[PDB]
Amino acid sequence: TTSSALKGAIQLGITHSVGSLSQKPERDVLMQDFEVVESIFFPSQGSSSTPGHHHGDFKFKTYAPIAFRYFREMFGIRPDDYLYSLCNEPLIELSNPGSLFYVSSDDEFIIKTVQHKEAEFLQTLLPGYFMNLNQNMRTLLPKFYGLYCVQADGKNIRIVVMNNLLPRAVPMHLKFDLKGSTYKRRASPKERSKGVPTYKDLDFMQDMPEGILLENDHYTALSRTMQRDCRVLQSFKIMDYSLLVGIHILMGGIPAFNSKGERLLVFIGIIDILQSYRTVSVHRPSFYADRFQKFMCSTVFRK
Amino acid sequence: TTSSALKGAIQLGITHSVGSLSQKPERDVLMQDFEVVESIFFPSQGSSSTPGHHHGDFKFKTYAPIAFRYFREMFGIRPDDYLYSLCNEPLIELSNPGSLFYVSSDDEFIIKTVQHKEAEFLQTLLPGYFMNLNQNMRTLLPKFYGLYCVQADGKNIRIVVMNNLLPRAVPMHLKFDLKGSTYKRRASPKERSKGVPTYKDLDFMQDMPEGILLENDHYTALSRTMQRDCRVLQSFKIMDYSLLVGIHILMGGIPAFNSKGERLLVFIGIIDILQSYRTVSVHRPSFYADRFQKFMCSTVFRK
């Protein structure tokens, strides 16, 4: 039960870590806060912790606690809802190729697994992530809610908690994953035997040759924050990220769009961020991010 | 003419540096931006610059240009007004013991001189200063508008541009400079032969034994952002700063206050910041900042 052992510790780990944060009074974030790493150990019969069929014996670390309560707050995630969704309702597994990929019962939170490299990375990129939120409210970047580590019998599973663009609340008729490149960028046979498959660039150019149409006001805004997100991402030497796009042929938090003659609710966000600088040229990530926006404006079309 | 040589270069230096920034389109700040140092050289007869009786021959460096346009913007300093006030109206000198202390004609900007140490410092503390603005709008900290350096015949005069709490627009009947300490913290004989002298702690405790009274709403707010500013300052290992307080016995941007029976417009802000970590204990700055607020609540009184 590699999984059930993890599944429980994560729920038990967060209840404590975040629960006990909520007794302390809130106070602004300082630079020092991004580097903190608070831990706590979870024995079977520890008074101040709890025992468990899950909690056989382990330690639970949470990175940058105070930054993440900020980030949650700024995302509008009331902590009661956070730790209800995660720790109180049986979260559910999901195949997606040692790394796991869990999801909340309410399907508003993804819990991914991440390698030591990709995790320490994220950690270093918190201050830019902060500088981003506070300057670009409509940022299509991933919404990171938390970063933790379940150290288990001499092995560390580190995990990231984040939003889940396309939640299941509103149905998705179409899903595209887009990089602005082309090579082997079709869907696998397996993938198109799904119900609402996630197509890719080449698929999009033959299946949606007419673009996805937007009114000048909505397009302007989108162009604007693509450009901005791309400038950030570029700054961090990041690449191989894609624009996940949920089409809904109609809390409609989407944009006003049109097919080749019909009303739409698109739903989009940038994904697969944590990958940068470990042999690409010094001007590669720039090229990648130009290609990106320039292409997302044969994807999202105007007038 | 050590001074007139500086006075002109500063005006000529900023016009160019900031003027030419305004042709480029605005774009968000990134962490990389805090470390940039842009320069430009000012010969007598340089086409793309200008000549000058002031500009005999010098180089002009501006630190973190893009962060400072952000900070200006956030302070509501329209750049046309910035470089009119500074570069277009004859700024005026001021004794205040090689360091000079200029002021704008309109008296809305102080131009101080700073040593290599205190300047590089400020530079390192920009990201926290950013994290502060964006989290505490009513921050009693200094408003840094710009940081530059006039390299002159093989010597660097570095200078800081900032707000000027008590401007002369509204008259100041009383001025206090307060640290929450006491030792040799009286006014010099010279100082009290001024018109509107800047008294200090001991003076304040005998001259204002009745506090400075505030209504629960206004006091709450003040307490709150003292506490917060002090937490920031503490974080940066900073001390020997004071609360400059302008009393006006009545664009009234002050707070509602009362004397021992009369209406008031107080005007306050934290000053003398750039001094930290260069032999004080690891918990000294904390002690300094506790003393501070705890004392500023025998200075600013409630109910």
Author numbering:
A (entry chain A), B (entry chain A): 57 to 153, 157 to 309, 357 to 384, 402 to 426
Paper quotes:
The reaction catalysed by the type I PIPK, or phosphatidylinositol 4-phosphate 5-kinase (PIP5K1), is the major synthetic route for PtdIns4,5P2 in most cells. To help elucidating the mechanism for PIP5K1 regulation by DVL, we determine the X-ray structure of the kinase domain of zebrafish PIP5K1A.
The side chain of Arg-244 is potentially hydrogen bonded to the main chain carbonyl oxygen and side chain carboxylate group of Asp-236, and pushes the side chain of Lys-238 into the active site. The crystal structure reveals that the dimer has a side-to-side arrangement, involving both N- and C-lobes of the kinase. Most residues constituting the dimeric interface are found within three structural elements: the loop between α1 and α1a, α4b, and α6.
